[PDB]
Design a protein around this ligand. Structure first.
Ligand SMILES: C=C1[C@@]2(C)CC3=C(C)[C@]4(C=CC(=O)OC4(C)C)CC[C@]3(C)[C@]1(C(=O)OC)C(=O)[C@@](C)(O)C2=O
Ligand SMILES: C=C1[C@@]2(C)CC3=C(C)[C@]4(C=CC(=O)OC4(C)C)CC[C@]3(C)[C@]1(C(=O)OC)C(=O)[C@@](C)(O)C2=O
Ligand SMILES: O=C(O)CCC(=O)C(=O)O
Ligand SMILES: O=C(O)CCC(=O)C(=O)O
Ligand SMILES: [Fe+3]
Ligand SMILES: [Fe+3]
Lengths: 287, 295
């Protein structure tokens, strides 16, 4: 795999979207894993064109070290794209995976959606700061690698992921380090020695844990809009960064299955209920 | 007080006109503090009157178990009570203390509502298991006493709280024990040896309590006394509420709310800073209040 004698780089396993528990142990051991072909070939295609009109009406910032410097972001994927709401979010591998990360026996679905983002790294965009996704829930790093999982991300490539256009540089095994710190020169002892691994073709995805260090690289090209679809998924006890049950129209919620209504907060798991009853009753969604 | 009689733990008491700093320091020392006249007796009585039809229509569950039985719980306080939504949730002392607990520099409101629950302990109802309210967020005990706060409770007396009718039993300074476990025989070594103290209160008194404080409803030993409480459960912005208030509370009521009341119920977002900024509970980069028409 490496020339004999070489420094071996951090292991980044890769499974086919038809694999089994097998993908999960790669997640447990490394903190991430690639699912090659996560979304079908025409599915990803129909999806990208469907959000191209919305992506077109996002002006680009040319700035300050923020994650908005020449990186454009858009989250109304259920509204804008029939392919997303009808096909992509009903992956049984997605759910069979989430149930192994999040759900406890007897309690139903321990998870729901945090965000559905399309991230498009514009050419010349500086490399994104290194971070753990779970910094979104600021106390979580304090629990170290023994803490439970709060967040996972099915990070899917829309346009191809190269080392040129700044695909995500992962750091496998970052979830097993003994202290979880901010990744900067004052707080991180290993800053500048952190060994990355860049991450894929359209429809491939990687299933990253919230504990894993990562970040978008510099998009060094002149023409490449590098586009992605992040399926952020949190445990049921945590609050979504998107208010999906207030912006997704009721017309679309009626077309979703019970699992997908639970993912978007149109149905309870009790958490997110309505005075001892499922919020789905009051909304006109049960029997 | 008592006669070399053994003296129980101290539960500090303040009037609602004390300084939120004096109250907060007490809360920090003991993890719980009584605020007398948190709500005026005229406010508490109108509230009790406005929820009472809903309370009477709630059947009492009697069971053959320790099942947390014979306790009515009602959460649609905003819909049923003009006093609650117009006055009680507008307590400036409530928001002063919440900020000192939850709100970060340069982010605005770090908290929102988990629940608004009328809890009426029926005559004869058995005592509740000792618990910490942050057990609702099961990973929280594992951070121990150094952990951040996830939840505080403004537990108000609607009818008098007495030692006989089931006033809550609290364990002051249990937010400072070095290991947070569930309170059971397997996991808790002080099990059965834990000294509680009732929250004796008159109508309109609150106690403010951290999610780190061991406590439990007491046994209601009376035959006539339906012991009514109002629990204002308040969590940090990154945590999920028990109630989906933005989906059951009507928009007509949303539009009459102050901006900070809208934030409490999820009709409006809160800006969190990480280099980056993110409207938590937002709409693709903007406040959810825009798509809702709340300006
Ligand atoms: C299921 C329960 C949970 C898990 C959560 C809880 C919540 C949210 C409460 C506790 C925390 C809080 O701050 O708010 C209130 C007051 C409303 C009380 C009521 C319930 C819903 C609960 C219950 O109903 O048991 C039948 C319960 O009594 C208790 C204590 O055992 C629980 O820890
Ligand atoms: C404000 C940001 C936060 C705080 C959260 C975040 C979310 C939720 C994301 C990250 C984690 C996740 O699990 O999902 C996604 C992919 C959607 C990415 C986009 C943003 C909104 C964020 C950002 O865009 O900054 C304006 C950002 O890039 C990052 C990484 O710096 C952040 O940690
Ligand atoms: O866009 C990328 O390459 C990674 C972005 C990411 O993971 C984030 O925004 O948190
Ligand atoms: O009603 C009480 O006195 C305590 C209730 C309580 O602690 C709870 O329900 O979580
Ligand atoms: Fe990230
Ligand atoms: Fe409690």
């Amino acid at each position: 795999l490496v020339p004999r004698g070489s420094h071996m780089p951090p292991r980044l396993q890769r499974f086919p979207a038809t694999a089994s528990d097998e993908i999960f142990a790669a997640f447990q051991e490394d903190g991430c894993v690639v699912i090659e072909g996560f979304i079908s070939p025409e599915q990803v295609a129909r999806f990208s064109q469907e959000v191209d009109p919305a992506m077109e009406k996002i002006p680009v910032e040319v700035t300050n070290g923020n994650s908005n410097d020449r990186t454009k972001r858009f989250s109304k994927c259920v509204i804008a794209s029939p392919t997303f709401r009808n096909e992509i979010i009903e992956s049984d591998l997605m759910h069979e995976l989430c149930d192994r990360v999040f759900s406890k026996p007897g309690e139903g679905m321990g998870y729901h959606f945090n965000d559905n983002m399309v991230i498009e790294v514009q050419p010349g965009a500086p490399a994104q700061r290194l971070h753990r996704d779970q910094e979104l829930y600021p106390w979580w790093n304090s629990m170290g690698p023994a803490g439970p999982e709060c967040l996972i991300n099915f990070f899917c490539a829309v346009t191809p992921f190269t080392e040129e256009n700044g695909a995500t540089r992962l750091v496998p095994g970052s979830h097993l380090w003994p202290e979880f710190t901010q990744i900067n020169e004052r707080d991180c002892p290993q800053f500048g020695k952190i060994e990355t691994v860049p991450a894929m073709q359209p429809g491939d995805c990687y299933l990253m844990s919230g504990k894993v260090i990562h970040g978008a690289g510099h998009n060094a090209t002149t023409t490449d809009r590098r586009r992605a679809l992040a399926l952020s998924i949190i445990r049921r006890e945590l609050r979504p960064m998107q208010a999906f049950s207030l912006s997704v129209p009721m017309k679309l919620a009626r077309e979703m299955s019970e699992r997908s209504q639970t993912m978007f907060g149109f149905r309870s798991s009790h958490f997110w209920g309505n005075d001892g009853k499922d919020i789905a009753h009051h909304l006109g969604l049960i029997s």
